[PDB]
Specification:
Chain A: It comes from Homo sapiens (Human). This is part of a larger assembly, with one copy of chain A, two copies of chain B and one copy of chain C. Chain B is of the alpha+beta class. Chain B has two helices and two strands; from the N terminus they run αββα. In chain B, strands 1-2 form a two-stranded antiparallel ribbon. By secondary structure, chain C is mainly alpha-helical. Classes of the chains: A mainly alpha, B alpha+beta, C mainly alpha.
Chain lengths: ~60, ~60, ~110, ~60
């Protein structure tokens, strides 16, 4: 009703905090990409696997350019 | 033992040892290196971790 | 179900491939699914990630950047009021780190 | 590293209490932080000084 829309507000400010922790660690994600990354980690998956995925996918758009 | 430091006390040369800080996947040896002088005895009362941190900062300079 | 739509959005976002009948997209989907369905990665421990957090706090202090270090610890204490913590933190950590960063906006 | 060493070596060798020698090393080290370019306000100064090291290392290439 009322709390179910302020709860996702309480998601947004945490999503803004991680937007600082992303840029002080120099990551290739932006704000839209990190939203998908939180949707990945809530279901449960090794982040070494995702990190190896992006560590290949980023080298497969600048190796063709 | 090539340099002069061999002739000083075994205790203070024993307290000189290398240390390495925490690593990053992007890294350079010049970025992560330190010499750490150990503090043993009750000498911790005279010298705290905060003065070690400032010691490390001026060493970085 | 939502994980599949998620991995499509992942390839779209990162690899910059918005064509899904492109064979490179489909090979990337096979690569993602085969990476996920054959894990050989160690399980994350909270204590090691805490040691990493304190270490990068030390690196921020050593290069004489006090306000960025204080904001770093401040933002971690605000973030940890939300398991999934350590997962996303270790993800950002391992994804990219190239040492003490020449960067600004320590008082935003 | 020399005016500070003089004031430290004076204020330890005359001092008769541990509370004096600790509080002398404290101000020794905080004056080292002030005289080196690692203060809060001199940060931009350091960020300028790093730029003149840049064109040093660049030159070797």
């Amino acid at each position: 009703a009322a709390a179910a829309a302020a709860n996702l507000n309480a998601v947004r400010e945490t999503m803004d905090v991680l937007l600082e922790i992303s840029r002080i660690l120099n990551t290739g994600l932006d704000m839209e990409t990190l939203s998908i990354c939180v949707r990945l980690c809530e279901q449960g998956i090794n982040p070494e696997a995702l990190s190896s995925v992006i560590k290949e996918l980023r080298k497969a758009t600048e190796a063709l350019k | 033992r090539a340099t002069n430091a061999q002739f000083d006390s075994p205790e203070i040369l024993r307290r000189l040892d290398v240390r390495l800080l925490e690593v990053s996947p992007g890294d350079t040896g010049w970025d992560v290196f330190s010499l750490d002088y150990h503090v043993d005895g009750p000498i911790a009362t005279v010298f705290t971790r905060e003065c070690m941190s400032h010691y490390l900062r001026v060493f970085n300079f | 179900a939502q994980q599949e739509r998620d991995v499509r959005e992942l390839v779209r976002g990162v690899a910059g491939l918005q064509d899904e009948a492109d064979p490179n997209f489909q090979l990337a989907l096979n690569f993602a699914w085969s990476n996920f369905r054959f894990h050989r990665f160690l399980d994350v421990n909270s204590h090691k990630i805490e040691k990493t957090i304190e270490g990068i706090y030390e690196k921020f202090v050593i290069h004489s950047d006090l306000s960025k270090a204080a904001s770093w610890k401040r933002l971690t204490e605000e973030f940890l009021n939300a398991d999934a913590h350590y997962s996303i933190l270790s993800l950002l950590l391992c994804l990219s780190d190239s040492p003490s960063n020449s960067s600004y906006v320590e008082t935003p | 590293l020399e005016c500070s060493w003089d004031e430290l070596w004076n204020k330890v060798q005359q001092a008769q209490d541990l509370d004096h020698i600790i509080a002398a090393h404290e101000v020794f080290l905080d004056t080292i932080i002030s005289r080196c370019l690692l203060d809060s306000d001199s940060r931009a100064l350091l960020n300028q000084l790093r730029a003149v090291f840049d064109q040093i290392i660049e030159l070797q290439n």
